[PDB]
Amino acid sequence: MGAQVSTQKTGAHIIHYTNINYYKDAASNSANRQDFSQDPGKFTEPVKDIMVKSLPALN
Amino acid sequence: MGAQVSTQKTGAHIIHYTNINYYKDAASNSANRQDFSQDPGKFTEPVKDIMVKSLPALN
Amino acid sequence: DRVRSITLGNSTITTQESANVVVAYGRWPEYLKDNEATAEDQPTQPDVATCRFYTLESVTWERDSPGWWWKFPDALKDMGLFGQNMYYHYLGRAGYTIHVQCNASKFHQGCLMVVCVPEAEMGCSQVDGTVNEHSLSEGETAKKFASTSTNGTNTVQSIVTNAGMGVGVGNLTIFPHQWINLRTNNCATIVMPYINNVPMDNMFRHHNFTLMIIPFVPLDYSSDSSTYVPITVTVAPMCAEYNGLRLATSL
Amino acid sequence: DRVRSITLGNSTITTQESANVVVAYGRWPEYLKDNEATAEDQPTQPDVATCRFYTLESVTWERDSPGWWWKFPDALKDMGLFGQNMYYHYLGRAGYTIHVQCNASKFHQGCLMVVCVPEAEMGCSQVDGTVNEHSLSEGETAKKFASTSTNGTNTVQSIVTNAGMGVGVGNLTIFPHQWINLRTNNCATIVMPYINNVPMDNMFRHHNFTLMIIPFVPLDYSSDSSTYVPITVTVAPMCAEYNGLRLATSL
Amino acid sequence: KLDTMEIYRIPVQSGNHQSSQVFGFQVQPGLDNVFKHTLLGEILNYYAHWSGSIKLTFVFCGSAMATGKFLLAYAPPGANAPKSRKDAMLGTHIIWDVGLQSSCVLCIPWISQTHYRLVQQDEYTSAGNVTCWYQTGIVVPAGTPTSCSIMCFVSACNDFSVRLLKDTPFIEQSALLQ
Amino acid sequence: KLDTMEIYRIPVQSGNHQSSQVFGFQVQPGLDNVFKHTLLGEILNYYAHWSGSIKLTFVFCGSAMATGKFLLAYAPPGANAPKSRKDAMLGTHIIWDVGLQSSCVLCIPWISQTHYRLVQQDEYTSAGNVTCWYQTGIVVPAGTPTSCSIMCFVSACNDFSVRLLKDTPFIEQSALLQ
Amino acid sequence: VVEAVENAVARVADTISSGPSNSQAVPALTAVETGHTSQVTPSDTIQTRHVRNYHSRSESSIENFLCRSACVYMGEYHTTNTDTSKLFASWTINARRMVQMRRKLELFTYVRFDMEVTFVITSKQDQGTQLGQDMPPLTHQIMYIPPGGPIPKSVTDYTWQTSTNPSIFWTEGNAPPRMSIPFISIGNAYSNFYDGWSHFSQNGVYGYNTLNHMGQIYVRHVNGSSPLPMTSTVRMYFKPKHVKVWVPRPPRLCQYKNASTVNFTPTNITEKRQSINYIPETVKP
Amino acid sequence: MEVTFVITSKQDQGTQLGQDMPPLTHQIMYIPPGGPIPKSVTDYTWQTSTNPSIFWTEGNAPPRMSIPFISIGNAYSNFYDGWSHFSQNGVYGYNTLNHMGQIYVRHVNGSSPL
Amino acid sequence: VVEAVENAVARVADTISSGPSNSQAVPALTAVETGHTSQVTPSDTIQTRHVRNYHSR
Numbered sequence A, B: 001m002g003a004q005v006s007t008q009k010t011g012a013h014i015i016h017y018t019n020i021n022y023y024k025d026a027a028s029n030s031a032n033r034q035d036f037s038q039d040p041g042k043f044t045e046p047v048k049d050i051m052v053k054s055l056p057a058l059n
Numbered sequence C, D: 001d002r003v004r005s006i007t008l009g010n011s012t013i014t015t016q017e018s019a020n021v022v023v024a025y026g027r028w029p030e031y032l033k034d035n036e037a038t039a040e041d042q043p044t045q046p047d048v049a050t051c052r053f054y055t056l057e058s059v060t061w062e063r064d065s066p067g068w069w070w071k072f073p074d075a076l077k078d079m080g081l082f083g084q085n086m087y088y089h090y091l092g093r094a095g096y097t098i099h100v101q102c103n104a105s106k107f108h109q110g111c112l113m114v115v116c117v118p119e120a121e122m123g124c125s126q127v128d129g130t131v132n133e134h135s136l137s138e139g140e141t142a143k144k145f146a147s148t149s150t151n152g153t154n155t156v157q158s159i160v161t162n163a164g165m166g167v168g169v170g171n172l173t174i175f176p177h178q179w180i181n182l183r184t185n186n187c188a189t190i191v192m193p194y195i196n197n198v199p200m201d202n203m204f205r206h207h208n209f210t211l212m213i214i215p216f217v218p219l220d221y222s223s224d225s226s227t228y229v230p231i232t233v234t235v236a237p238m239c240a241e242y243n244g245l246r247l248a249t250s251l
Numbered sequence E, F: 001k002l003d004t005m006e007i008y009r010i011p012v013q014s015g016n017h018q019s020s021q022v023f024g025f026q027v028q029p030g031l032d033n034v035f036k037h038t039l040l041g042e043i044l045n046y047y048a049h050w051s052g053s054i055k056l057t058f059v060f061c062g063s064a065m066a067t068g069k070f071l072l073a074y075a076p077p078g079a080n081a082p083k084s085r086k087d088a089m090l091g092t093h094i095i096w097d098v099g100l101q102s103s104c105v106l107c108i109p110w111i112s113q114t115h116y117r118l119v120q121q122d123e124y125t126s127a128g129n130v131t132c133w134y135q136t137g138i139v140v141p142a143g144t145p146t147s148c149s150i151m152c153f154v155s156a157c158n159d160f161s162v163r164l165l166k167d168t169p170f171i172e173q174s175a176l177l178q
Numbered sequence G: 001v002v003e004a005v006e007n008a009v010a011r012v013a014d015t016i017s018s019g020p021s022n023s024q025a026v027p028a029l030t031a032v033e034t035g036h037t038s039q040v041t042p043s044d045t046i047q048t049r050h051v052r053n054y055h056s057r058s059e060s061s062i063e064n065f066l067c068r069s070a071c072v073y074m075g076e077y078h079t080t081n082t083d084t085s086k087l088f089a090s091w092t093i094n095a096r097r098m099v100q101m102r103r104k105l106e107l108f109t110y111v112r113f114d115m116e117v118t119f120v121i122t123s124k125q126d127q128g129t130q131l132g133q134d135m136p137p138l139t140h141q142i143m144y145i146p147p148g149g150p151i152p153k154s155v156t157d158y159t160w161q162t163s164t165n166p167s168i169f170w171t172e173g174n175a176p177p178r179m180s181i182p183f184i185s186i187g188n189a190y191s192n193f194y195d196g197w198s199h200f201s202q203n204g205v206y207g208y209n210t211l212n213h214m215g216q217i218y219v220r221h222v223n224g225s226s227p228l229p230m231t232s233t234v235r236m237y238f239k240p241k242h243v244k245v246w247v248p249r250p251p252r253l254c255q256y257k258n259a260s261t262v263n264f265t266p267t268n269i270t271e272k273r274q275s276i277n278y279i280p281e282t283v284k285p
Numbered sequence H: 001m002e003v004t005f006v007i008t009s010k011q012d013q014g015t016q017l018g019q020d021m022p023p024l025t026h027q028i029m030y031i032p033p034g035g036p037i038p039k040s041v042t043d044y045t046w047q048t049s050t051n052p053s054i055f056w057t058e059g060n061a062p063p064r065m066s067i068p069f070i071s072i073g074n075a076y077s078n079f080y081d082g083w084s085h086f087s088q089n090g091v092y093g094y095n096t097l098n099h100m101g102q103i104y105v106r107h108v109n110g111s112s113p114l
Numbered sequence I: 001v002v003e004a005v006e007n008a009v010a011r012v013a014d015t016i017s018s019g020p021s022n023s024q025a026v027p028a029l030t031a032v033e034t035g036h037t038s039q040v041t042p043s044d045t046i047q048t049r050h051v052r053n054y055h056s057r
């Protein structure tokens, strides 16, 4: 029946849930809360020549 | 559909139930009523040297 | 079976009339590990300069004695390098070995209860009032219970039957404890791990546990036996750790 | 080639204009081992709470400055847990990293010598007299050389050409040393191992080494350049060990 | 100075000023006036809990002929703030030498008894202080200015996180159409 | 004695006191004043039904030179409580000899026509009584106290259980903020 | 048919153990003039222990940061009146009148998402000397009009036929109405800032109001009733989902002035303290 | 936790009774520490842009929602034998550690001649 | 997809049959001073029949 089973948010130191889509448009679907990606170098390291961080910056 | 089938509470001297999770967070799940473990020795026998109970305690 | 020896650092305790040893909840002290740590700086571990027996002051067990208590830590803040490390750091962690001593002849009689109570929050003898720090602890000197209800400002309600906490004293056996029965043994020994809801804590702000000593059967003797019978406490920290070095604080 | 970083404990030093590092006699600090030990009790090793950089007070390098010296240890007896461990033990052992800083513009000129002298026994300015402890050291404050011969009771004969020891100052290069030439570099760094004739010693009774800072070429500048030029010292102990725990001594 | 660029500049100068402290402030990244309107503080003020290490970068903007060394120190909480270079010397510190590389980084590491501190910090979740002192002093040749300035940048490290969303107290209105 | 430690101490002494009973009480672990504020009674008062065996431990706190023997007896219900050692001798009993081991355990076994008894016990779910008598007597040498005390502990065995949760009658209030 | 989908949680980096060091590597010396932020950690500058860090950056993702309902409009309308225009409410759609949602959205230059729209409607008996009646439950009509549609003139206008416009009818006492709206813009993303004009001669309308153009909302009572006057209030709530944003910006410092412009009054950088060295004493007896 | 609310209403005693009110609606808002506090029943803070709120109408089933474990520690503490200030004074005991926000509740109709 | 989860019920201990005895084993003599609670059952002190106990905690 086109069900999806995925894991729930838990802690660290029976845990999954099921979902069905009812509507014909994807703009009716619930929010996408479980996607956690990053790419910080876009803003923190926007330079042409790579800087090693153990070497001096200049010279 | 990620269903779970487990046994019901009955007596001693057709007996199982099904469950589906609907929400994305595990803090939304129902209570965990069917787990029965014990470790009484933590409070009743907290001694370093084991006491046999057929032998005298001292000497 | 009744003889015991305990060695820690450069200190050693012997005894010839012991019962057994109580490991608080079956858990021995241990250092904090990586999958349970939050503070990031590398910690110091002195390891023989702090983990050794310190002896406090004695009390006199009289025919009418209600009992005594101490607060840990802050009973050891003036004990050598353990106290000095407490003064200079923000975070500390340690377990303990406690040893209580009281000897008497085969013609005396009496019974003491020795109990360790984690997070022993106490009440004031004025219902709409609060306690002062002096009323909870006098350092290496013991505070004293009463036999009747108490009055006074900022002082703890210290009638011995309610143990300063609003419970029935005869139930204190839910905690780690031993008994000293004068006909049976002459010392008690309790090993206590670090017990908190966070991995480390500040050693001046928070009292981790209270040691209580309560006579249930009063001391009694006959014609010309010895009258002076003292009780002595000796405590040694174990697996001591400190984080957050800065300038020394002052009370 | 000129940039350097040094990390110890929770402290870090950077520099952009260094020359090199001097390892006193090619020997790095290290702990005492078993085939060279005499004292029997297990020692304490705090290891991050003591082995870190402490910064002393600065001095002002004027156009007429003869020089400065410090005594080690006893310049660090009030520095946190290192000092507290010094107070409570009979025997101690440690090496050091010393770092001297002095920056100026490309329009100033001057030249300083930075030298470490083991067992710098000093003489009195009265030939048939002896020195007081105050005349040898003021803790974290530097003592000052003179440019002429000195007088006074119990004070050190401190004319800079004889270095307080009856030698020619231009020969002090036999010891571990560096130079700070204001046109070349702005800092000096010396790593010093434990140097004694016994494996451990008491840290109050015995000065292990003296740090001397002597300008050979005086500070000079022109019309409206900056007049205030300070010098700063920073020292970190390494591989620190203590034996013989007892009650705290008092001076 | 609240409406001028001088609010960003820390002043230093030559001569004997070893006894004078350069600057000092509390480590309260979401509450103290020094930090609450920077990018990091602005992000934190949407949340209730924070955790992680912090980076402070210091840049020297004097002429190419000025030299000097500074001591940058951080003290965990439990005592009052140091009043002299000797006391601050006992904390976590770095000695910065001004040279062809113009920038030094002091890292404040996460030393705490709890996993998280409150963005609205109180006595219980305090974190300590930062101070700066002259290690040697500023020396210059003739024909150069004698006063100079230093600037300071803040950012978060790669172990940093926040939680417990809330509304911010920095924006408001009295009626609609605003 | 309701506010003193003497409430916990049972008195005994030397001489001819064979006719005097030492103590006696009903077995009502959740209702009788003797048992309702101990740990076991406190747990039971949150429930309506209980079942299982009970342990009573007795410890002798006299000087190391006192000797004696006691008879500890338990009588199931159906008759009135015994008035002499001879009658109590016919029930379930143990003869305790005071020695280097200072503690004796009397176990009350589950003898009942129903599987459970009411925590709020009535005539129908009664369980009987416990009594203590001098089996020989207390003998001491010269120079020793002649009076002594005995203490008593209660706990539950490994066949014990409760059911039918309810609110407890030991806590109350007249208004909020309490 | 069942299909398993695996979720990867992303926790933060651990700290590695580090000892003493004496070398030529200088991690602490940098140069900000390059435009580069230093990637140093505590392990480069001090001695550290090993820590296994389990914290997660889950609640600071854009989707979790933005997916929460927020009010964007409130309006009132009467059942009876002598003005003929106070019997229905109407407005032009945007998210610029309530400052919290506006400032939150304005941390980014461009945004794109779908919306979930909720309405909250309440009513009240107008104050008067003669009260007391027996009215049936009130019903409400909400109609959305894309640009170019005919505009209602009154509460009995033919335009309420809503043949092609979507409408909602609702009765008081039930759960609040709700519907979802897809990403509807002639561009590839919504624009929060526009530094340009509407006319090719560099004049006309400046800035935001050139690009939005997303229709109007009208709301009326359906009963056509009320011997005694009554008032209703409608409130609109927005929640974005399936979000993407581009080009972060510094957050707004000055207070907002109007909904058409970015105009402001000069404000200070922060608040003052006594001294550049001042730090209060907190450890005192 | 699972949190449930039960809400009831009543006509105040008076000499003149009798009216025709529509069903009453209620708003419940939770405020974590540091949030702005409402001053009245028409304060802007009831916009609840980021705070979670519940709206409810009389006659329906009682409202309900679930809350996860929210504490800066590893567990909730029921007893705390310590102080709030590093000089061993200030606030004693439990009130040092809890700090879990406030709850505000109002009518939504803004109504009631009587 | 269905997934079976098995629940284990934990009932209390049975009592074992026991007859007369005359020996040196003394289960009834203890020492509370140790801090230890005695783990004796009725079968150590009296004669008992065998019971299969079905009660659950």
Ligand SMILES: CCCCCCCCCCCCC/C=C/[C@H](O)[C@H](N)CO
Residues within 6 Å of the ligand: G093, G094, G095, G105, G111, G115, G117, G142, G143, G144, G166, G167, G168, G179, G181, G184, G190, G191, G192, G214
């Ligand atoms: C019958 C009831 C229908 C309700 C109609 C609601 C439609 C609302 C208009 C759709 C466009 C809203 C999407 C967001 C608009 C702006 O781009 C954003 N606030 C940011 O620019």
Ligand SMILES: CCCCCCCCCCCCC/C=C/[C@H](O)[C@H](N)CO
Residues within 6 Å of the ligand: H001, H003, H028, H029, H030, H052, H053, H054, H065, H067, H070, H076, H077, H078, H100
């Ligand atoms: C919009 C309605 C939201 C309702 C908000 C209810 C939140 C209640 C606060 C959450 C924390 C409650 C958890 C228990 C608190 C204490 O730790 C325990 N009572 C024991 O200490």
